[model samples]
Target: AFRYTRSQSFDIFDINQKCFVLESPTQLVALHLQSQKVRLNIALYRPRGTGQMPVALGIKGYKLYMSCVMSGTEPTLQLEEADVMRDIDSVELTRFIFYRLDSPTAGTTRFESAAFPGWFICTSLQPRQPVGITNQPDQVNIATYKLSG
Candidate 1:
C-alpha cells in the first residue's frame, strides 16, 4: 500500500508567462518559455476543507520529490529522489509536505513550507533564475502563481 494511491494531478503555471523549468541533470528554475510548467502530482494527506492542505508535490511521470531543506543557515529548495508514497506521520512527511495556499482575491497560489514557516516557493521578477524560498509573498518577487490542471 505504499507506492500506489489515488490522487489529483495538477500543474503550477506562474505569471509573466513563466513556468517552472525542469532542467536535465538537476537544473530547476523559472523561465519564460513556450511550455515548461511543472505538472506536479499533489496528494493531500489530511482531509482539510480549506484551500491549504498537507500536500506532497512530486514531478509527474517521475519520482522526484520537492524537498525544502530547512537546515543549514537558510532554507534550501531542491528536487530530490524519494519514495513514491509512504509518509504516514508528520516526521516522515514534514519535508515533502507543503501548505498549498490559494487565494481567489490575489488570483494566485503559493506553496508555503511546513518545515520553515512563512517561507514560500518563490520566483524571480525577471525570469530565468533559480526558484527559491522567500518569507514575503510579494508580487514583485512573484511568490504567488496560477495553477493549471
Candidate 2:
C-alpha cells in the first residue's frame, strides 16, 4: 500500500512461509528471508491504498512487472519504471498496479493482479523459485504476506 513503505518489508506466499521476495539480476527475484535480506516495498502511489488497492510495489527505483496480464504459471515479476509520479496518468502502467487484499490471517496480506481476476502473486515451495502469479489457490498454497512490516 501507499502507506506501508517505511522500511523492512517482504511479500510472499505460504510455502514454508520463510522465503521472501528480494531483488537480483537472474530470473525474477526470490531469495531467503534472512534478516535484512528479503524484499521490495509497497510504493503506494494512492488510488486505493486500502484492501485490494491499486498500488505500486517497488523498491530501489524499480517497480514491478512489464507484462500484460500479471498472471502466469511461472515467475511473472520483473523491474519496471517505478516513477508513478510521472506515469500516474498513463494507462499502460496498469500492470504495475496490484490490489492489496488483506487476508483473514491477522496482519497478513495478499496481492491479486489488478487486470487479471483470481491471479495471485505466489512464491514457490523451495528456494530459487522466482515469485510468480497463478490462478486462485486451487490446492493448499497461500499467497500471504505480512505487509504491516
Candidate 3:
C-alpha cells in the first residue's frame, strides 16, 4: 500500500500476484491488474528514509524488455522500459519479467531479476549501498525482502 500526502493509501500488483486492498482516506485510484487494456508495468520504489522497496505503479506504457547480445565477455544483460502497446523486435521475453517467490530457506522471499538466470537482486554494503545482481549462494541476505503492512 502507498501512503499519499493526505494519509491516503492505495494497493499495487504485478503480472501474477494480487495485492491486498486497503481502505483509502482519499479517492481510490485502483488499477485493475488482470485487465490487459489498462495494464501497466510496476516496479519497486524504495522511498527515502525507509528500507522497504514498495511498488510504484500507475505509470503507463513503460514495461520491462530485454535484448541479448554476445560481447567479448559473457552475454550482456540489457534491460529497458518499452511501450507495451508496440512491438519489440529481436528481444528475449525473459528480460523484464521478475519474480518474488519463496526462497528454499524457510520464511524468506527472493527477488529474482531475470536479466541473468539464477541471479537475484542484491545490495552492496558500501556507501549508498549500490544495488547488485548475483547468483552466489552466500549472497542470499542481499536479495531477501520482508514484506510489511
Candidate 4:
C-alpha cells in the first residue's frame, strides 16, 4: 500500500507525459511508474483557500488505454473526467498464473496492455468495492460495452 503526502500528488495523465523532479514550491505529486521508478511532479491546481484546497491527485479527467491482444495491444494515455472514472489514485495489480511468463493461457483473463514507451502493462483490474453504507440507493447493475480496437 502507498500513501500520498500533501507534498506528493498527481493527476492521471501526468503519469505518462511529464518527468518528475523535486517538489514544487506549492503542491507536489508523485507516481510509481511501470519502469519501477517513482515519478514525482507538482500539482498545479490553484489554492481555493485555507479550508478547501483542491487535491493534487484526482481521477477527474483521467484516462486508461487498454488492449487484449499481446502483440497488437497498445494504449494511449487518456484522462478521466470528474463526471466519470474510478475514484482511486493508486492502482494495485497482482501477478497471477496468467501473467507468470510461462503459464498457459487457459484459465486467465487477458488484461489490457499499455503499449507506452515505458512498456507498461495493466495485467488486471479490480474496481473499488462499494461501501454500501451511504444514503444512495442500493442496486446491482451489470452493463457491457464493445471496444473499438
Best by lDDT: 1
In candidate 4, what are the lDDT values of residues 9-34, reduced to their tens digit?
33221212222222322212233233
Q: Pairs clashing in candidate 4?
A: 9-28, 9-29, 61-79, 61-80, 61-81, 62-79, 62-80, 63-78, 63-79, 63-80
- Quote each prediction's TM-score: 0.82, 0.65, 0.40, 0.19
Ranking by TM-score: 1, 2, 3, 4
Model 3 worst lDDT window (10 residues): 20-29
- lDDT, residue 27, model 1: 59
Descending-lDDT candidate ranking: 1, 2, 3, 4
TM-score, model 1 to reference: 0.82
Residue 70, candidate 2: C-alpha displacement in angstroms: 7.2
Q: Which residues of candidate 4, in runs, are more than 4 Å off? A: 7-72, 82-149
State each model's CA lDDT, in order: 0.72, 0.54, 0.36, 0.21
Clashes of each: 0, 2, 0, 10
Per-residue CA lDDT of model 3 for 1-149, tens digit only, reads 22222111222232223321212221112223342322333443222331223332222332333233334765443434443322212235434434545545554555554435566544333222223456662343345543332
Top TM-score prediction, candidate number: 1
Model 1 global lDDT (CA atoms, 0 to 1): 0.72
**Residue pairs that clash (backbone atoms under 3 angstroms), model 3:** none
Q: The CA-based lDDT of model 2 is what? A: 0.54
RMSD of each: 3.4, 4.9, 15.2, 19.2
